[PDB]
Design a protein around this ligand. Structure first.
Ligand SMILES: Nc1ncnc2c1ncn2[C@@H]1O[C@H](COP(=O)(O)OP(=O)(O)OC[C@@H]2O[C@H](O)[C@@H](O)[C@@H]2O)[C@@H](O)[C@H]1O
Length: 183
């Protein structure tokens, strides 16, 4: 595949939130978001697609980041170069596990931290997948509404802010099916 725009929303200053159907690895935004864990394990669904696309270049960048950063703190966001990928940078986030205490709040928090990091690097665009709803077990709709809520909230409260466009990237048929059905 593949690229379809499914929904577009105006954020607080008219910045655009686009929900799109695509493989996130194929998106050429300034940043793409990789949901990972404290050890930067590259074995979630999105991690596997980034590794498929970027190969060794991608993996060694993640390793170098783990060595420089140390373990990724709860809800933490960190950035590596997008070697092997269309995206300029990869923002790595410590994705909460469904069922862990305060897991919804932490999902919101991690999203905002990814946005702050992109802003700190003066990035114009950032692509999020449905963080938490793969290997970490969130229900797809719950994950998606938390992420979209957290992006909107960021832009209401952030004065500015270099981000022009936010992509919310859906790939699995269940997520797409529920997004479209329930909207
Ligand atoms: N090519 C793709 N593009 C965009 N989204 C995709 C793609 N493939 C799958 N997805 C969707 O990405 C969402 C996030 O899933 P994961 O990447 O598995 O992320 P998460 O559930 O947060 O957890 C992965 C994490 O990686 C570590 O190995 C592990 O500690 C943790 O489980 C899911 O809805 C999944 O269907």
């Amino acid at each position: 595949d593949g690229f379809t725009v499914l929904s577009t929303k105006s954020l607080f200053l008219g910045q655009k939130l686009q929900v799109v159907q695509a493989d996130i690895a194929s998106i050429d935004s300034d940043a793409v978001v990789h949901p990972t864990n404290t050890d930067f394990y590259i074995g979630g669904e999105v991690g596997n697609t980034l590794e498929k696309k970027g190969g060794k270049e991608f993996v060694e960048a993640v390793l170098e980041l783990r060595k420089k950063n140390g373990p990724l703190e709860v809800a933490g966001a960190a950035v590596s170069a997008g070697h092997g990928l269309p995206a300029k940078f990869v923002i790595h986030c410590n994705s909460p596990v469904w069922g862990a205490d305060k897991c919804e709040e932490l999902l919101e928090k991690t999203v905002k931290n990814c946005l702050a990091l992109a802003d700190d690097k003066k990035l114009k665009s950032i692509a999020f997948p449905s963080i938490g709803s793969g290997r970490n077990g969130f229900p797809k709709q719950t994950a998606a509404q938390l992420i979209l809520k957290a992006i909107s909230s960021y832009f209401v409260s952030t004065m500015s802010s270099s981000i022009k466009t936010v992509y919310f990237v859906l790939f699995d048929s269940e997520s797409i099916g529920i997004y479209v059905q329930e909207m």
